[PDB]
Amino acid sequence: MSMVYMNIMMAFTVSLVGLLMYRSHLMSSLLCLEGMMLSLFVMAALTILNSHFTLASMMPIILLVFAACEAALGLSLLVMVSNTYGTDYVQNLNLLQC
Amino acid sequence: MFMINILMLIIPILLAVAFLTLVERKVLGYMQLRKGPNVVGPYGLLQPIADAIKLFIKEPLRPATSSASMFILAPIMALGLALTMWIPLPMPYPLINMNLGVLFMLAMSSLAVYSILWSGWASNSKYALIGALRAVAQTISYEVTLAIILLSVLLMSGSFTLSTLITTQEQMWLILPAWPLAMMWFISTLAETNRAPFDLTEGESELGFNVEYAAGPFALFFMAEYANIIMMNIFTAILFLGTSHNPHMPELYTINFTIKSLLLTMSFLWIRASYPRFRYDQLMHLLWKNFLPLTLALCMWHVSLPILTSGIPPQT
Amino acid sequence: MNLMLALLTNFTLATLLVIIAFWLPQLNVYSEKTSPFSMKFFLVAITFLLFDLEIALLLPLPWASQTANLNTMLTMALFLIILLAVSLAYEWTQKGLEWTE
Amino acid sequence: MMLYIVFILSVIFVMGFVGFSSKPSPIYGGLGLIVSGGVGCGIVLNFGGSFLGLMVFLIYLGGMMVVFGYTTAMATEQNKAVLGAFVTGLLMEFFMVYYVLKDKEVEVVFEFNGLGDWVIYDTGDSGFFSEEAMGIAALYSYGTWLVIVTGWSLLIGVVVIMEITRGN
Amino acid sequence: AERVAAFLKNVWAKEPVLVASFAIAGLAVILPTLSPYTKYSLMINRATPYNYPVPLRDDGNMPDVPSHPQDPQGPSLEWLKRL
Amino acid sequence: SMMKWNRERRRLQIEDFEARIALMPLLQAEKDRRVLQMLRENLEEEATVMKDVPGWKVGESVFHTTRWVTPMMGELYGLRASEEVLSATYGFIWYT
Amino acid sequence: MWFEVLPGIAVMGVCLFIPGMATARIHRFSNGGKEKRVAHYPYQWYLMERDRRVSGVNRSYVSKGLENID
Amino acid sequence: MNPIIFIIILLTIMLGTIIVMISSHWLLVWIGFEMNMLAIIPIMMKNHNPRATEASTKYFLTQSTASMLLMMAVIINLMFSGQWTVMKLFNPMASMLMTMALAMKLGMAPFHFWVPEVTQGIPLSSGLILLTWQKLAPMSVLYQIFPSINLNLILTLSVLSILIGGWGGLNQTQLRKIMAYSSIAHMGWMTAVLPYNPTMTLLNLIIYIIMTSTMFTMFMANSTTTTLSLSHTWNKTPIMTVLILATLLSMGGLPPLSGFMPKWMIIQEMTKNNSIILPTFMAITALLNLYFYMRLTYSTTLTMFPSTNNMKMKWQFPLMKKMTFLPTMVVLSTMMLPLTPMLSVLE
Amino acid sequence: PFFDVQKRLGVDLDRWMTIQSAEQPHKIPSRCHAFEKEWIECAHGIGSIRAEKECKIEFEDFRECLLRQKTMKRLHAIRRQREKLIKEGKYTPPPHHS
Numbered sequence A: 001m002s003m004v005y006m007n008i009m010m011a012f013t014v015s016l017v018g019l020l021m022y023r024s025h026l027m028s029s030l031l032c033l034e035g036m037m038l039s040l041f042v043m044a045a046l047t048i049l050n051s052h053f054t055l056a057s058m059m060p061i062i063l064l065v066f067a068a069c070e071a072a073l074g075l076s077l078l079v080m081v082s083n084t085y086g087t088d089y090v091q092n093l094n095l096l097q098c
Numbered sequence B: 001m002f003m004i005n006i007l008m009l010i011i012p013i014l015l016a017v018a019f020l021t022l023v024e025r026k027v028l029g030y031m032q033l034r035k036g037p038n039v040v041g042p043y044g045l046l047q048p049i050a051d052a053i054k055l056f057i058k059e060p061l062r063p064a065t066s067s068a069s070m071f072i073l074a075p076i077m078a079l080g081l082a083l084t085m086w087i088p089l090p091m092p093y094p095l096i097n098m099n100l101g102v103l104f105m106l107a108m109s110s111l112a113v114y115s116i117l118w119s120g121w122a123s124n125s126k127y128a129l130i131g132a133l134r135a136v137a138q139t140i141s142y143e144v145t146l147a148i149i150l151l152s153v154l155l156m157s158g159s160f161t162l163s164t165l166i167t168t169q170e171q172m173w174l175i176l177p178a179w180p181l182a183m184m185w186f187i188s189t190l191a192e193t194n195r196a197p198f199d200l201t202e203g204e205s206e207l208g209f210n211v212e213y214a215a216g217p218f219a220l221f222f223m224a225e226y227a228n229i230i231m232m233n234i235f236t237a238i239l240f241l242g243t244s245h246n247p248h249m250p251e252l253y254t255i256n257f258t259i260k261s262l263l264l265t266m267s268f269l270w271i272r273a274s275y276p277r278f279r280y281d282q283l284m285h286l287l288w289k290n291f292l293p294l295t296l297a298l299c300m301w302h303v304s305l306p307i308l309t310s311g312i313p314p315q316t
Numbered sequence C: 001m002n003l004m005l006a007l008l009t010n011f012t013l014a015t016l017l018v019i020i021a022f023w024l025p026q027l028n029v030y031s032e033k034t035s036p037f038s039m040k041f042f043l044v045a046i047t048f049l050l051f052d053l054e055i056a057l058l059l060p061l062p063w064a065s066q067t068a069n070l071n072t073m074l075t076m077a078l079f080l081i082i083l084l085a086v087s088l089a090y091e092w093t094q095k096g097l098e099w100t101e
Numbered sequence D: 001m002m003l004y005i006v007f008i009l010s011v012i013f014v015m016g017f018v019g020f021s022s023k024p025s026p027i028y029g030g031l032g033l034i035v036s037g038g039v040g041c042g043i044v045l046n047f048g049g050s051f052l053g054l055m056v057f058l059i060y061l062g063g064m065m066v067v068f069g070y071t072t073a074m075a076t077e078q079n080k081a082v083l084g085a086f087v088t089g090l091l092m093e094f095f096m097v098y099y100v101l102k103d104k105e106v107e108v109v110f111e112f113n114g115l116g117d118w119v120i121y122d123t124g125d126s127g128f129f130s131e132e133a134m135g136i137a138a139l140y141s142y143g144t145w146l147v148i149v150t151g152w153s154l155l156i157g158v159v160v161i162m163e164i165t166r167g168n
Numbered sequence E: 001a002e003r004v005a006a007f008l009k010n011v012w013a014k015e016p017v018l019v020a021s022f023a024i025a026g027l028a029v030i031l032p033t034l035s036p037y038t039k040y041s042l043m044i045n046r047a048t049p050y051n052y053p054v055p056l057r058d059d060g061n062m063p064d065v066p067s068h069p070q071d072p073q074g075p076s077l078e079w080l081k082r083l
Numbered sequence F: 001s002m003m004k005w006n007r008e009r010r011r012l013q014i015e016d017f018e019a020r021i022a023l024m025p026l027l028q029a030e031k032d033r034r035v036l037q038m039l040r041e042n043l044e045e046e047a048t049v050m051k052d053v054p055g056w057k058v059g060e061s062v063f064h065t066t067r068w069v070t071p072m073m074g075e076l077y078g079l080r081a082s083e084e085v086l087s088a089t090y091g092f093i094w095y096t
Numbered sequence G: 001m002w003f004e005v006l007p008g009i010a011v012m013g014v015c016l017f018i019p020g021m022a023t024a025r026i027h028r029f030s031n032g033g034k035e036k037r038v039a040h041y042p043y044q045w046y047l048m049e050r051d052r053r054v055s056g057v058n059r060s061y062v063s064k065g066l067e068n069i070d
Numbered sequence H: 001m002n003p004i005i006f007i008i009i010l011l012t013i014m015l016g017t018i019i020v021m022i023s024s025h026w027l028l029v030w031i032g033f034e035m036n037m038l039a040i041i042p043i044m045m046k047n048h049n050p051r052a053t054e055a056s057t058k059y060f061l062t063q064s065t066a067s068m069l070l071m072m073a074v075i076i077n078l079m080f081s082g083q084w085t086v087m088k089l090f091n092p093m094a095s096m097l098m099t100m101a102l103a104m105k106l107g108m109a110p111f112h113f114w115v116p117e118v119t120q121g122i123p124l125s126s127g128l129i130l131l132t133w134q135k136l137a138p139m140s141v142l143y144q145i146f147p148s149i150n151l152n153l154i155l156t157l158s159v160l161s162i163l164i165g166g167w168g169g170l171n172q173t174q175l176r177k178i179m180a181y182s183s184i185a186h187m188g189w190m191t192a193v194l195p196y197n198p199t200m201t202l203l204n205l206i207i208y209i210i211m212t213s214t215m216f217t218m219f220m221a222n223s224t225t226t227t228l229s230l231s232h233t234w235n236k237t238p239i240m241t242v243l244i245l246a247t248l249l250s251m252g253g254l255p256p257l258s259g260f261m262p263k264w265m266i267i268q269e270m271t272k273n274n275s276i277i278l279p280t281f282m283a284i285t286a287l288l289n290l291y292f293y294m295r296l297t298y299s300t301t302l303t304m305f306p307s308t309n310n311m312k313m314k315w316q317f318p319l320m321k322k323m324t325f326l327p328t329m330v331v332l333s334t335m336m337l338p339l340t341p342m343l344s345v346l347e
Numbered sequence I: 001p002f003f004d005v006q007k008r009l010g011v012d013l014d015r016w017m018t019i020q021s022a023e024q025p026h027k028i029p030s031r032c033h034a035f036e037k038e039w040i041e042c043a044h045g046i047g048s049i050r051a052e053k054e055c056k057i058e059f060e061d062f063r064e065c066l067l068r069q070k071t072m073k074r075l076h077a078i079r080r081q082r083e084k085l086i087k088e089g090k091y092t093p094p095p096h097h098s
């Protein structure tokens, strides 16, 4: 493909693993989720720009607008957890075990 | 010669910033029936040099900060960006001739918020952190109308290049066709740079983020703050008071352009000496309930007005 | 290459002032001195973010005016701004932009 | 060493992801994303996308990420794993970097070549407009459907987040 | 007829900002349809030659395509100069 | 005033574009010759480097089609000077 | 008196005059006494690169006129 | 929540689902999913209690990860084909990501750990949308990409779904959890036959929705969420118990009820392809589902569990719930077997 | 689509951006326009089962213009040969290649 894809694509993989291995904070997971959309933006634009897909050039913008809107939703829920417990630890979201 | 060219743009800014402090203290003095700095050197012309030396040889407190890395990172980010917002400004020739220069000065401007945010975190104090957050809410709020007001003007220019705002006003200033936008742009630039009557960070009896700083590090946050005051007014002059450009005498542009920037800057000092200070909620409700409704109304008027009059500017 | 130099020089210089700022006063060997959440602030950050995203779709308007579909381009330009106004009218009426507890 | 600027940037780009994928304190995690977002723009710029490159700075870095730092400073209450993960990440990058600069061919899932990014660029370009600019402008001339669906989602987003946060 | 006047003058004394906002926006949506010059805006955009005008092979039956740029056939921009 | 000035700017752009259109036929003609020449330079030196390779063909298309395919950057400037390679790849993107 | 404020303004005025004046004169020093070529779109860049090759010496600001035609 | 806002939020969930169904561009397919998740989290929070908050947070973290993977697949496919058409994917690695991404969206095992918990934290009406409407959009995409799906990946997810659905439900006493695990089980049937005859995936989807909608409707009528609280129904609304009994036997696939129709037709199509071992295993393990369906019938209709004194007060008021379409749904849930050849309308 | 509404109503919602040989603003062609056009017209109206086997040639060229794997392999071979002959005193680059 090209040397740049190896690193851009590996960036998505790194962030994905970071999303699937929580440490303590719910916030740190949102960054990894927002890390994944950053890699997809870059990879999308590189493919579109290189091949001169003229009309596709608006596609990365939409990916960013919707992905950003999702983040606002995720941050709103993180706030409503800190309100209930005072911290955003993931181990507090264990009520629904039973 | 390019490296020589940069230094011919960085040092003058630092000296120009230094003597804006003198001009502010003097101008504020005469509007208050007093004189201001006139003892240190002829007419106070050495006053900035005394202050500069004094601050840099004073012990910095640097208390037990939580990180002590964001403490160093905040002043670097602030002063690094402030200088960076001058490279595309045509005077009349940009140092870097960006095709989306207007879009570059918006991108860099929104990054200055971090300097505020990181200073609050580094301070290790709960009180400071609330101080930073209040200044962040004000800054981002009033940067929404800058984006739209700027966008509305470009509908009359036709592109994002800054050198094309010179061509647009070759017959007449944009202050005339767009004085409603000019009124709300000038006030937005006051609120972005924490200038009175929008200075709540320095609004003693109410709060700042750059309070724990003293000596040299403090002087950095001061240079950045005053380096943007000049830059915003240079931006305003290019946007609403376009100077005619004669290629054979490029210096003629600079003299006229410099005057219009100095007058706009001295309007910041004029305004600070006149009015009281807004409350925090009162300046939020000035944006979300007064400027934003009108900015949206005027943005619609400017998308359609060129179409209904057949006056669409060229893309190139 | 020019812009990279301009960024490097600007940030390189800013760092030199910082280090000498933290070390030049240390030339003077001074005696060792010894020794919540508010919801209404979060909504401002989120409200800005959503409007900021709605602005992102408005940025390419200067280029859109050069098309040969002014009827369609004009209709959508007003459609976005009008909805950008509706998002404001909704928060305004539902007491979103208020600072009294 | 300048003809490989894009590849060099991408190596810094990956190292940033290891920075916050290891999950340090959120304050430092957000910083790594900022450095990664800024470098990410540098990659897009060198492929000819100047509007898209600056859009990340204005919307992603100066926009979203400010709110992330804004929320962290207000809901975060200011280890061996963090160092072990960070150390592990760089080593994986180092070997991948080492094995693509040695034989200029690395096969992990896909077949990645290592001649240089410039080798695929388009030779011919003599237009009087930016193809990226004309593509983005077509949002209003062509993308009527995208505008409607996108606008209704942002409008709903405002409504949705007002319900979530009210709490009653 | 009285209610409208009794309501227009009430907001004008209380909400001058919004009265100007809705008035200005209302013109943005109405005037473009009434304007007689809106059609020229389209004509000028179509007249801007971003692309090369590839010539057409001549088969013989085309007394509408000029043989030379200065021939009298084809579209004429004499309307744009006077405008 | 803005309407009048903006309308003249649209006439001055059309004149600016027609000067380009009258010049495209010459510029396109030159580029065709230049690109073909650069390809043959690589072709001649492809034989030199690979005249003793076990089972290699000179100038072998990697496409089943016989249609002309516009060369990419790697094929033209493959073995030229770095300064000229840099100019043709990032010269325009880096121009201030 | 108010005119004692001017000396500070002039020095501030001069420091804002050097950056603009320096760029204009420095550009003319490198471009053979002309304005630095502006290349915002690929067509403009293509002609500038053509000038570099056509000029002989590898300089884009060295113009060749009719005298260079047979 | 203001009533008008609730309708517009509900109407948005349909628009998101519909955009996925009618779109022909992978971008709009992703926008449809994003619009759907955005407008469904608010209803899950309507009661505003810690469990509702946790359920949405667990739900958001799952649908978001699936969306990124789906977008990632949409881009790998773009690199190898240079197009966005919603059809067979052109890169096998992209197909795996799309398959798993849609699996996380449907809750198919082993991406299932959130379904029991999410469904258990939100009201009954919110669970109905979560288990019936939310599966149409992911199933629309599978119906269009199945030629390129990996045979062993899809069948493996189907096999694990039936097993974990059956085994999970044996240990449960919460009706919201039982329906959650029952949902996972029926998903295996929907996807197991997908490679062979997708039309039988729509037959099993339509019948599953009708039966599940009936169950949630009758639990909402009596505001019952646990096994014990449901056992008082005989003493309050005896008719409701007989309707419950009929459906649970239908859900269990017992002849001659409608719920036998899907399982019956899936076995037919898999065998024509000479798949004898897989249908036999699937049918046997379905008995695990029929077990805890029967266990509900023992405590609800076939026995009279102890009552409470206060129940005598409830006899003096009627059911003021809407119970929309309950009479029609229950009849179509049990009396459709003679109409089996009507499935050709789905072709 | 699952519900082919667009074809029924005769309205174009998102079919303009599906491919890269569709109409683009200012007639800007994509880099692989010639290959994509040929592949699409080859495999039109014969379903994907036949197109997989009958239009394989037209599609391999298309995927060659997209990722240029064969071309980058060929250039890697020439570089390795030339590099080997460089450090053996057996190669002298031409004048214009220096």
Ligand SMILES: CCCCCCCCCCCCCCCCCC(=O)OC[C@H](COP(=O)(O)OCCN)OC(=O)CCCCCCCCCCCCCCCCC
Pocket (backbone or CB within 6 Å): C082, C085, C086, C089, C093, E011, E022, E023, E024, E025, E026, E027, E029
């Ligand atoms: C066809 C394409 C265009 C489609 C446009 C359709 C979308 C329009 C979007 C509008 C933007 C959202 C704003 C709408 C909400 C208005 C504000 C509101 O919510 O109501 C507030 C007000 C409450 O009243 P209250 O404060 O309690 O007491 C004093 C009232 N006098 O309640 C009220 O009673 C205030 C009166 C209602 C506001 C009327 C606004 C009318 C605006 C259109 C005017 C057009 C005039 C243009 C003519 C210009 C010619 C000079």
Ligand SMILES: CCCCCCCCCCCCCCCCCC(=O)OC[C@H](COP(=O)(O)OCCN)OC(=O)CCCCCCCCCCCCCCCCC
Pocket (backbone or CB within 6 Å): B308, B309, E030, E031, E034, E035, E036, E037, E082, E083, F003, F004
């Ligand atoms: C309550 C009342 C609300 C307000 C009602 C409307 C007020 C009047 C309109 C003001 C708003 C529009 C602003 C237009 C400014 C245009 C500048 C101008 O006025 O100059 C006239 C200009 C001169 O023509 P020119 O071609 O240059 O002549 C020399 C050629 N050899 O020629 C032109 O500019 C071109 C003509 C543009 C016409 C635009 C207006 C189209 C609508 C037709 C007029 C009806 C007005 C609408 C009334 C209903 C309001 C709802």
